[PDB]
Amino acid sequence: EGMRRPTPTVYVGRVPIGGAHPIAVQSMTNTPTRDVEATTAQVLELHRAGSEIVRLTVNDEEAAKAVPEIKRRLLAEGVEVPLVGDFHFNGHLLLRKYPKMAEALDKFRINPGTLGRGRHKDEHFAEMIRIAMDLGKPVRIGANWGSLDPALLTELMDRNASRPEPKSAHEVVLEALVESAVRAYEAALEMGLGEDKLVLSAKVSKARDLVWVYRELARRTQAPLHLGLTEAGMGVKGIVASAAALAPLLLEGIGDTIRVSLTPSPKEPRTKEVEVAQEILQALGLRAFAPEVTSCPGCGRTTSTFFQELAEEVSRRLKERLPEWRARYPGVEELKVAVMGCVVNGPGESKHAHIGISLPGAGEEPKAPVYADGKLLTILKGEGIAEEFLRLVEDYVKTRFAPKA
């Protein structure tokens, strides 16, 4: 778009991850995995909302035993969404003990910071890779600075201490995180895990750090990169931090799949993080999921209640019509609609949309121009402007995005 950083293709189930493929949205469940009903339902829900890949924790024996049945229930519904198993501390134990789960999973996640501490640490690593290789499973090697390999930090602390100009302890923590991921990645390649089976990540919780980190990742490896700002937080803060962190990197062509790590409000659904990941990619023109509305903030030049109501109804109708438009009209995901408050930027901004309307603001003739494909399509006056506009959009979508050839 672009342009994309070159990487081999990693297939997570039927979903290809890589530089020649769309950046894939994924998310993670928060149901107890031992609860097959709750976990199956949420996987469905996340998949429904647009999660192309879904991760779940496989944290103990009960969780592992449920994974085949969850996978069974998804398949019985024709739901071929890929499951990634999240493993910490005991990943080698469960995968060994439970081969039906290892087989059920479509990808394993390994954290090089939660393997175990020492010389059995390598064995756990090697066991997990071996099982992936025997089954032909892809692996994510994912570092996270909340669980940084202490031995590596020490080693780089030692290294940095004797540089002619030592770097800051903070910069060294980052170095050590990158180094954890890269060295684990290179160890897996040395064991013979194919380039087409290995995804990397190395997450931190501050936007400025994360850009540093993934720039080094991209520089030092060829692997597709899983990008996210971990422990993003709640509400507006969590949404903003996630977007601000990922955007500079994505605009640089770094990132091949993303997850947004929002803390849900108790009154919020787990599908919200999917919404955010989608809006990030679409805002950067890197994906198109669903029609969008470009609207002005409204100011003293337009009637506030009228305007905000019109903008809200247009966005709700688009969302309403989307399930039908997907089936009927292929390509409708790229639809861009404008709703503007007055003649200052109304017409101009409307012409940058597929279709748009500007209301007459203060000082203006009581008319509301509608533009389509850059030129005046018609002029609305009177009551029922919202529904009139939405009829124009409906016909527009039918015409521009109709199936052809």
Footprint on residues 293-352 left by ligand SF4 (CB under 6 A):
296-299, 301-302, 340-342, 344-346
CA–CA separation, 138 and 196 (whole Å): 8
Instruction: Choose between 7 and 144: whose C-beta lies nearer to ligand SF4.
Output: 144
Number of residues that bind ligand SF4 (CB under 6 A): 13
Q: CB of residue 85 vs ligand H6P: minimum separation in angstroms?
A: 11
Stretch that binds ligand SF4, among 37-45, 194-202, 291-299, 328-336 (CB under 6 A): 291-299
Q: CB of residue 223 vs its own copies: minimum separation in angstroms?
A: 22
* 342 annotated as belonging to a binding site for a ligand: yes
Burial (CB count <10 Å: 0-12, 13-18, 19+), residue 163: exposed
CA–CA separation, 311 and 338 (whole Å): 9
Instruction: Choose between 231 and 334: whose C-beta lies nearer to ligand SF4.
Output: 231
Question: Do the beta carbons of residue 224 and residue 18 sit within 8 Å?
Answer: yes
* 296 annotated as belonging to a binding site for a ligand: yes
- Give the DSSP per-residue string, 61-126: HHHHHHHHHHHHHHHTTT--PPEEEEE-S-HHHHHHH-HHHHHH-SEEEE-TTSS-SSSHHHHHHH
Q: CB of residue 136 vs its own copies: minimum separation in angstroms?
A: 26
Q: CB of residue 297 vs ligand H6P: minimum separation in angstroms?
A: 6
H or E stretch covering 318: helix 304-328
201 contacts which partner out of ligand SF4, its own copies, ligand H6P, none, CB within 5 to 8 A by kind? Answer: ligand H6P
* 349 annotated as belonging to a binding site for a ligand: yes
20 contacts which partner out of ligand H6P, its own copies, ligand SF4, none, CB within 5 to 8 A by kind? Answer: none
Peptide bond into 101 cis (omega under 30): no
Q: CB of residue 228 vs ligand H6P: minimum separation in angstroms?
A: 5
Residues 121-150 that bind ligand SF4 (CB under 6 A): none
According to DSSP, residue 4 is labeled: P
b/e map of 372-396 (b: 16 or more CB within 10 Å)?
beeeebeebeeeebbebbbebbeeb
* 80 annotated as belonging to a binding site for a ligand: no
Q: What residues are designated binding site?
A: 296, 299, 342, 349
Q: What residues are designated binding site for [4Fe-4S] cluster?
A: 296, 299, 342, 349
